[PDB]
Amino acid sequence: SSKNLGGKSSGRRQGIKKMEGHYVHAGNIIATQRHFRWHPGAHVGVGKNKCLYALEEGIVRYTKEVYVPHPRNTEAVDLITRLPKGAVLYKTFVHVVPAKPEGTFKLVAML
Amino acid sequence: YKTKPTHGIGKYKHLIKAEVRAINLGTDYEYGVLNIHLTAYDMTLAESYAQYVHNLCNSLSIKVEESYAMPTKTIEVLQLQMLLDSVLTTHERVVQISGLSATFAEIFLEIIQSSLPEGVRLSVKEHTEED
Amino acid sequence: ARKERGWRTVFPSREFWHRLRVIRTQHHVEALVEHQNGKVVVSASTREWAIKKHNVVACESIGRVLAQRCLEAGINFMVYQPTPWEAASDSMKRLQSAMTEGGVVLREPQRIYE
Amino acid sequence: RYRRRAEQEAQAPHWWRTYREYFGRTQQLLERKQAIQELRANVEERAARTASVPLDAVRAEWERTCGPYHKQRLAEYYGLYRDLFHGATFVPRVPLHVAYAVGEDDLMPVYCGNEVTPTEAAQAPEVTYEAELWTLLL
Amino acid sequence: IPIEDFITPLKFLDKARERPQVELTFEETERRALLLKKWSLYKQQERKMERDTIRAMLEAQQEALEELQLESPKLHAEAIKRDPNLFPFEKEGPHYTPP
Amino acid sequence: SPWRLLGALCLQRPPVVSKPLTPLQEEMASLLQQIEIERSLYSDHELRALDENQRLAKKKADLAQDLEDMWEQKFLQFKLGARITEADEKNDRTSLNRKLDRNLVLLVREKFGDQDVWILPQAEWQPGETLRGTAERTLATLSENNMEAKFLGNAPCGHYTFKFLGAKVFFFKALLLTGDFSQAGNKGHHVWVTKDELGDYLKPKYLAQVRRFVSDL
Amino acid sequence: DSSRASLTRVHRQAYARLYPVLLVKQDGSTIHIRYREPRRMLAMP
RNA sequence: AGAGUGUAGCUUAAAAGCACCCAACUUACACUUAGGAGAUUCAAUUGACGCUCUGA
Numbered sequence A: 001s002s003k004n005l006g007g008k009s010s011g012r013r014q015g016i017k018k019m020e021g022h023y024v025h026a027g028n029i030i031a032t033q034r035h036f037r038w039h040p041g042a043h044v045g046v047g048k049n050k051c052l053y054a055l056e057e058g059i060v061r062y063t064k065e066v067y068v069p070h071p072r073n074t075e076a077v078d079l080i081t082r083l084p085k086g087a088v089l090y091k092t093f094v095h096v097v098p099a100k101p102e103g104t105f106k107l108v109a110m111l
Numbered sequence B: 001y002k003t004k005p006t007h008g009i010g011k012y013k014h015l016i017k018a019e020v021r022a023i024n025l026g027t028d029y030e031y032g033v034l035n036i037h038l039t040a041y042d043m044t045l046a047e048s049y050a051q052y053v054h055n056l057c058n059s060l061s062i063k064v065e066e067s068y069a070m071p072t073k074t075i076e077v078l079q080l081q082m083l084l085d086s087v088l089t090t091h092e093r094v095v096q097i098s099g100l101s102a103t104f105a106e107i108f109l110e111i112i113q114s115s116l117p118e119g120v121r122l123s124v125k126e127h128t129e130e131d
Numbered sequence C: 001a002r003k004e005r006g007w008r009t010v011f012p013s014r015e016f017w018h019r020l021r022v023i024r025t026q027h028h029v030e031a032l033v034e035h036q037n038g039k040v041v042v043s044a045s046t047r048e049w050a051i052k053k054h055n056v057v058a059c060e061s062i063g064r065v066l067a068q069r070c071l072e073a074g075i076n077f078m079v080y081q082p083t084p085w086e087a088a089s090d091s092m093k094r095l096q097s098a099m100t101e102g103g104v105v106l107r108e109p110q111r112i113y114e
Numbered sequence D: 001r002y003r004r005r006a007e008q009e010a011q012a013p014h015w016w017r018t019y020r021e022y023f024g025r026t027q028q029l030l031e032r033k034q035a036i037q038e039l040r041a042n043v044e045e046r047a048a049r050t051a052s053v054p055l056d057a058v059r060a061e062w063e064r065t066c067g068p069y070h071k072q073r074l075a076e077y078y079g080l081y082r083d084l085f086h087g088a089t090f091v092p093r094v095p096l097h098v099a100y101a102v103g104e105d106d107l108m109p110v111y112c113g114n115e116v117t118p119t120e121a122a123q124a125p126e127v128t129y130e131a132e133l134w135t136l137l138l
Numbered sequence E: 001i002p003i004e005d006f007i008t009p010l011k012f013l014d015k016a017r018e019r020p021q022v023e024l025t026f027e028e029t030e031r032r033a034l035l036l037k038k039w040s041l042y043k044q045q046e047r048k049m050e051r052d053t054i055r056a057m058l059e060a061q062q063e064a065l066e067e068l069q070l071e072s073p074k075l076h077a078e079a080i081k082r083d084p085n086l087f088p089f090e091k092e093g094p095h096y097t098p099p
Numbered sequence F: 001s002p003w004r005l006l007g008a009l010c011l012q013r014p015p016v017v018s019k020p021l022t023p024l025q026e027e028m029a030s031l032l033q034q035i036e037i038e039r040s041l042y043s044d045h046e047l048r049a050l051d052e053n054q055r056l057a058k059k060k061a062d063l064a065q066d067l068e069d070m071w072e073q074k075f076l077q078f079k080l081g082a083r084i085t086e087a088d089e090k091n092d093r094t095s096l097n098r099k100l101d102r103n104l105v106l107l108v109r110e111k112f113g114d115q116d117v118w119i120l121p122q123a124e125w126q127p128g129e130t131l132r133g134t135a136e137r138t139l140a141t142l143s144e145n146n147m148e149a150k151f152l153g154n155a156p157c158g159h160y161t162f163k164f165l166g167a168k169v170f171f172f173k174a175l176l177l178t179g180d181f182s183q184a185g186n187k188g189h190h191v192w193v194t195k196d197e198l199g200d201y202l203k204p205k206y207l208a209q210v211r212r213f214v215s216d217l
Numbered sequence G: 001d002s003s004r005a006s007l008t009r010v011h012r013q014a015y016a017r018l019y020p021v022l023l024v025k026q027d028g029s030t031i032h033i034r035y036r037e038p039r040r041m042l043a044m045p
Numbered sequence H: 001a002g003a004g005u006g007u008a009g010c011u012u013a014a015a016a017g018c019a020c021c022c023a024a025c026u027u028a029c030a031c032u033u034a035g036g037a038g039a040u041u042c043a044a045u046u047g048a049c050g051c052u053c054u055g056a
């Protein structure tokens, strides 16, 4: 008969959309997941899904940085407290090294 | 990534332990969970003593797993001669201690003796009790 | 000019231009002004040996000094981003007050897009 | 403590790429001690239990001593040494006090980094620096 | 069944109007402040002394355990062996008057 | 390498009476008391004194004192044992009951042929015998008394080296619960001693270093 | 070192008064105690 | 009588940073907030007082 029934769910198609070095315009989704596999860094936002999106035009970069959580989020704090006195956690981040300058001064007129 | 040289830089769970006998071997020794029962008539005094003990333990790199208090026993005594009542109370406060190597324990005991407050009594014995 | 927008999981927030970083230790109280770069522009410490002459009061004094320094530099805006306990603390509050008095806003205006 | 440790780690270089990669007397002492002692005596704690500290004096002291040290940092921030001198830093030792005239009084002072408009800076400023020869430049 | 005596009883709720009056002077408060710091200092000194006492003792013990070992490798182990005397250790503290 | 085998014991007396407080300490205590008085919320005497008194006056217009008096009388009656059974004796160095406030230690005399040894309970342990056992034996023997010498552990306190023939002197701790002494004025010159006293009496460097592992107090 | 944990304040907030009572058990030994009401002496049988 | 030397507990600090202590939150510890105390052993890289170690 088969006692087990139910798990016929498809794959979520999650993962990295933009790998390191890829040029990225503002608003594009860099990477999608459940549970922070990758974290947001410079010029990278977060949705409600934990999906990372780019906040500026330029090159995506991945980097191992030091994890220091917000003091109001409690679990992380607890974990930190638990750790021995020389250790630091480390975590993988996604930055967007911005390409163009925010703007340039151009000549309007000679008054 | 796994194939990268950076693999497992985020690994933290081996730095945390998220999960009793008396081991007296040959040249390396351990007393098993010693309960220091601080019996006294003043509520404050016993507590103070307990606190001090705890502090000492902390200083000396010794674990303090439990530091509960036992209930206050109302020993109601009739002062016979004309019945004059005197409802005294005895307060017991405990500080459990695990790891302790040969030389340390004696020293600790000595320290305790030196520090003993005025009208307070000790009892250092094993964990096997029913609260 | 832009601000680093993200770092939303991490603390503290790098969305600023100028950051006021207070460093309390044993003895002496540092009070800095920083960029995204980490370039320490304007400091005020009790270790400076000029304000070592003449603690909550000390902290306040330092803050006051910094405010003057900020003015001199032409830094008028910070995002002060402390821990909750730090925020609560009296000394920090005093420092903030001093800064305000000096004329250095601890909020910092928006980027202006478009 | 953890935060401090993290900061320290960040400050260190590492080998895995990162955010930095892609974006970035005895007598005097004795005298000082004595002074401190005197101050303490004067206080005698009561004062602490809300004293203001004279700011002008402090400023003067700063100017005398570590003002020069401070100014280098400021210069670096403002990119004078990279633009003005193509690189290569220096500590401005001599304390320069330039002030622009506005009416009869007041005088608008030019500290290092201050906002001052061309209206106030229409006429040439008054200058003082307390030293004994030089070539002033703007 | 762990039941402690930390709960503030129900007898003390209504009977709370007898002393709300705490009105100190400047002089008194100042004096208190002066005292407290001094007391703290004294405590610190005492703890330092205690530490010294402990440390010295430890050192002595270590020395003994070096010497013993040097002069009898059979005996060091024996010395180390924790005796059974400390199952029921008992001692009352000092009183104010003897019998 | 003939190691001559001498044991020893650094005997201890637990202080009976409490210590006298320092001026500062006293002041602190007083302050604490005051604070306690301030904070506290009712007393059974204070409720049954004040209110009652108030009532009485009212009644008149229309107990505690006696109790206090009684208490005072009782206090007057109850004569206590002396804290000072030390300075009143003064010359009594040989009595165990002497210093109630401080801890104490035994200190014996032995004049030999070659040396003339001012001694802290020494012993001569046998290779087959244990050190602890030897110490116990010594305690039993030389002083000649019936004692409950509560030890702590089998590990020692401090050892010391004299070398002519290599040799040693091995010290332990023992805390006297109740030492029933037979014949107070015997010829074996034994002395009970505080910290200062210990420092004073001891001529040699061998026993002058013993005072570091004594409890200073 | 017997006076280190002797200088004790009541760390609880709401509580009764307490007086320096001299308690004596059958050993003949006084103790400073904080018993109900100002009972100076309470000799124990 | 000789060797190693010599910043407060400690330091590839140069008057620092950690350790440390009293209060108030705390069953207590812990955290946190307020306070507290501290040092170049002494004379011009040299010498003379302090320890540690080895002899008598």
Ligand SMILES: [Mg+2]
Residues within 6 Å of the ligand: A007, A009
């Ligand atoms: Mg599936």
Ligand SMILES: [Mg+2]
Residues within 6 Å of the ligand: A008, A009, A010, A011
């Ligand atoms: Mg499927």
